[PDB]
Amino acid sequence: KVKLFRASEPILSVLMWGVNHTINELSNVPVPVMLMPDDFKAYSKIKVDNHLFNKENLPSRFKFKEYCPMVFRNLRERFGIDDQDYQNSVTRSAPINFLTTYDRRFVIKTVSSEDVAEMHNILKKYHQFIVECHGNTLLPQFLGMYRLTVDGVETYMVVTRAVFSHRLTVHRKYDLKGSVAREASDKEKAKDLPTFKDNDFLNEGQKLHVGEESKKNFLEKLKRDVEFLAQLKIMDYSLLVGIHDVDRAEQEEMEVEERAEDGPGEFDPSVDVYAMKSHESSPKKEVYFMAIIDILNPEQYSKRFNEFMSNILT
């Protein structure tokens, strides 16, 4: 029951402390019929000074600001994330790393003041857009926005649902825009899990085999989402593409158990929300994770971007 907020860096402990603290407060705050325009200009601020006390893991002094907390609670509900689960993923053990919760469910990115600014501008429209699509979207699902202060330095963070599966392993990833001229630098290509780009993707004849029912529901999301990004005049985002090779993982698992001594391709679509199985007619048995990232030629992109993503599938 006892949380120590132990982390490799103080910032992280403060993060764990803040999510823990703010989620508990929300738990005493009745759940509103609807949201109100002020909820979109609201915030919580807490400043801690702990003298000669409770300093094993937390600094004596820090600040924690949560943006628009009523809105993000409701956003969580819409995306079917229970506050307690969220709270636990962040607090049970330090996030890892751009961070991930220890259980790989939530991404936590550090962002700009301008990003936080941009979140506010698009927030009323984004909330409404999440409602009229019932949370069915390739877009980032935003769960919280925070400003931490440690040693008088301010850090902004945005929490999202993870694109990749919290269990299944990604063996190959791309970041796609659709033009110009994009590839992975010999630097990247020589990393463990290179972020490949379009020309890399096109250049390798890469195709994803998902089957018609899935392809249609995916393309119908992509269409609505990217029109929304066009309306909001947003630009330069990407389609994160993760590929899981089922047989490869099973072998990797087997090699993992043998070493220790000295089911495959399955995922819960309620948790691994961006994941699609490969069509039974696929070369390899694969699992794909696809979503739009980095939303923080306007109507052009919409078309440029959309036509491309549409050609990845079969």
Burial class (CB in 10 A: 0-12, 13-18, 19+), 144: buried
CA–CA separation, 254 vs 23, rounded Å? 40
Beta strands 172-176 and 195-196, pairing class: parallel
Out of 33, 34, 38, 280, the residue judged to bind a copy of itself by CB under 8 A: 38
Among 3-11, 133-141, 246-254, 265-273, which window interacts with a copy of itself (CB under 8 A)?
A: 3-11
86 sits in which H/E element: helix 83-91
Number of residues that bind a copy of itself (CB under 8 A): 30
Q: Which of residues 64-83 bind a copy of itself (CB under 8 A)?
A: 69-70
The tokens describing 116, both together, are 């936080």
Crossing angle of the two packed helices 212-231 and 298-312, in degrees rounded to 10: 170
Is 33 a binding residue for a copy of itself by CB under 8 A? The answer is no
Q: Are 274 and 290 in contact (CB under 8 A)?
A: yes
Catalytic residue among 109, 124, 173, 223: 109
39 is catalytic: no
Q: Are 102 and 91 in contact (CB under 8 A)?
A: no
Query: Considering beta carbons, is residue 27 or 251 the nearer one to a copy of itself?
Result: 27
Which of the listed partners (a copy of itself, ligand AMP, none) does 251 bind, with a CB threshold of 5 to 8 Å by partner kind? ligand AMP
User: Least distance from C-beta 27 to ligand AMP, angstroms?
Assistant: 24
User: Least distance from C-beta 161 to a copy of itself, angstroms?
Assistant: 24
Distance of CA 77 to the CA centre of its chain: 16
Q: How far is CA 193 from CA 96, 160, 170, 178, 293, in A?
A: 17, 21, 9, 21, 18
236 is catalytic: yes
Burial 71-105 (b: 16+ CB within 10 A, else e): bbbbbbeebebebeebbbbbbebbbeeebbbbbeb
Q: Are 73 and 24 in contact (CB under 8 A)?
A: no
Out of 10, 46, 83, 103, the residue judged to bind a copy of itself by CB under 8 A: 46
Is 217 a binding residue for a copy of itself by CB under 8 A? The answer is no
Q: Which residues of this chain interact with ligand AMP, rule CB under 6 A?
A: 41, 98, 107, 113, 116-117, 120, 147, 160, 162-164, 175, 195, 240, 251, 255, 293-294
Among 21-29, 129-137, 142-150, 227-235, which window interacts with a copy of itself (CB under 8 A)?
A: 21-29
282: nearest Cα among 233, 249, 244: 244
Query: Considering beta carbons, is residue 3 or 120 the nearer one to ligand AMP?
Result: 120
User: Least distance from C-beta 1 to ligand AMP, angstroms?
Assistant: 31
| SS3 at position 292 | strand
User: Least distance from C-beta 110 to a copy of itself, angstroms?
Assistant: 23
Is 29 a binding residue for a copy of itself by CB under 8 A? The answer is yes
User: Least distance from C-beta 90 to ligand AMP, angstroms?
Assistant: 15
Among 23-31, 228-236, 244-252, 285-293, which window interacts with a copy of itself (CB under 8 A)?
A: 23-31
Binding site for a copy of itself (CB under 8 A): 1-5, 24-25, 27-30, 38-39, 41-54, 56, 69-70
Q: Which residues are catalytic?
A: 109, 236
